[PDB]
Design a protein around this ligand. Structure first.
Ligand SMILES: C[C@@H]1CCCCCCOCC(=O)N(C)[C@@H](C)C(=O)N[C@H]([C@H](O)CNC2(c3cccc(C(C)(C)C)c3)CC2)C1
Length: 377
């Protein structure tokens, strides 16, 4: 019965993917961003210039105040609000209703996006990173405890404005090709994984693999970019610059700030390399790789001029808090968050990015010795 959930995600490019939800009795409809990089369910609950509607606790007979404040600071953006519970449903999801924690957002800074069409965020990660503390049950834990929905979900994020699917409770085999390859969830807080090897155009970066995971590596649908630790970011940008030295880009383009444009349909895709991330496998000394095309880490944007030039932002940025496999990385792939078996699955998506001579891939098995040493302690 997963077909009812296919194509239940929408979004604008760089602005996240949302699913339609209802809160309260009678049901109030809100668009909620799906974020595997946090664990708080939160909705606008007060007027905001960029909100087109919001949760009105005053109108829900099933609302219950928790008499406790809450605030969440992200890498970029933050909000504060009042905690409570209410009944929640997913119209294009399973046919159930859960009593869930809801943070009613009353103040926010650089969080809501101008003309974005979503009004809240659904944090799909584990209680350990919930605010104010791990005793606030995240939505998906409530869904699993209160219903018969199996303890996993999968995300198929499709590129450019954007759409996709969130399959709640299972795997839809018509959304991917090939085999699913699984990597262990190292720890149930973020969706933390271990990267064991990195290659650019087939060339190993040849760094101590601990650097790739310093201080952690996570899968985060709520972060747009691929974010790399400083040492890894410098090696990759050095390598991507060299592969595309045919052409010249402002140094502010490599910092994510400036666009680059080309006369429409002449984007020189061939001079940007592919990036291969190797992930810890399920059996001893075994890994698999995902290959990222340049169509994934060059994000399309709007021409500042009156031209029809294709314009792009560099969507690899530097991090001081570990590797983040963001939406840019997930777009090629069908991604299974198998919480019940503590693993994450990757396969080539049915809506996969298309190059003329290259293709995004999920390939295994690979042999990788000493994968355990790649985890950071
Ligand atoms: C704020 C956003 C939700 C709204 C914006 C969605 C699309 C906009 O896209 C721009 C973009 O890429 N943004 C805004 C990144 C830079 C970011 O900050 N994204 C967030 C993620 O939750 C961040 N997740 C991490 C994180 C960082 C810091 C704290 C925490 C808590 C405390 C919640 C555990 C979690 C794990 C990386 C969601």
């Amino acid at each position: 019965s997963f077909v009812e959930m296919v194509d239940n995600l929408r979004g604008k490019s760089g602005q996240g993917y949302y699913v339609e939800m209802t809160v309260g009795s009678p049901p109030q409809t809100l668009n909620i961003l799906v974020d595997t990089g946090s664990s708080n369910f939160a909705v606008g609950a007060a007027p905001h210039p960029f909100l087109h509607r919001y949760y009105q606790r005053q109108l829900s007979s099933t609302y219950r105040d928790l008499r406790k404040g809450v605030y969440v600071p992200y890498t970029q953006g933050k909000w504060e609000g009042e905690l409570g519970t209410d009944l929640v449903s997913i119209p294009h999801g399973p046919n159930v209703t859960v009593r869930a924690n809801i943070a009613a957002i009353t103040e926010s800074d650089k969080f809501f996006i101008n003309g974005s069409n979503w009004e809240g965020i659904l944090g799909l990660a584990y209680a350990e990173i919930a605010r104010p503390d791990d005793s606030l049950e995240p939505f998906f834990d409530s869904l699993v405890k209160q219903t018969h929905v199996p303890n996993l979900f999968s995300l198929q994020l499709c590129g450019a404005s954007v759409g996709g699917s969130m399959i709640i409770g299972g795997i839809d085999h018509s959304l991917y090709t090939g085999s699913l390859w699984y990597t262990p969830i190292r720890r149930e807080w973020y969706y933390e994984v271990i990267i064991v090897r990195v290659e650019i155009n087939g060339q190993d970066l040849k760094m101590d693999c601990k650097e790739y995971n310093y201080d952690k590596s996570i899968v985060d649908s709520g972060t747009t970019n691929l974010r790399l630790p400083k040492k890894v970011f410098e090696a990759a940008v050095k390598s991507i610059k060299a592969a595309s030295s045919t052409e010249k880009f402002p140094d502010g383009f490599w910092l994510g700030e400036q666009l680059v444009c080309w006369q429409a349909g002449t984007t020189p895709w061939n001079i940007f390399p592919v990036i291969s991330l190797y992930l810890m496998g399920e059996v001893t000394n075994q890994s698999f790789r995902i290959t990222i095309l340049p169509q994934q880490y060059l994000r399309p944007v709007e021409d500042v001029a009156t031209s029809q030039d294709d314009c792009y932002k560099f969507a690899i940025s530097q991090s001081s808090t570990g590797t983040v496999m963001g939406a840019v990385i997930m777009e090629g792939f069908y991604v299974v968050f198998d919480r019940a078996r503590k693993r994450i699955g990757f396969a080539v998506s049915a809506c996969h990015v298309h190059d003329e001579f290259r293709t995004a891939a999920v390939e295994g098995p690979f042999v990788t010795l000493d994968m355990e040493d790649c985890g950071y302690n």
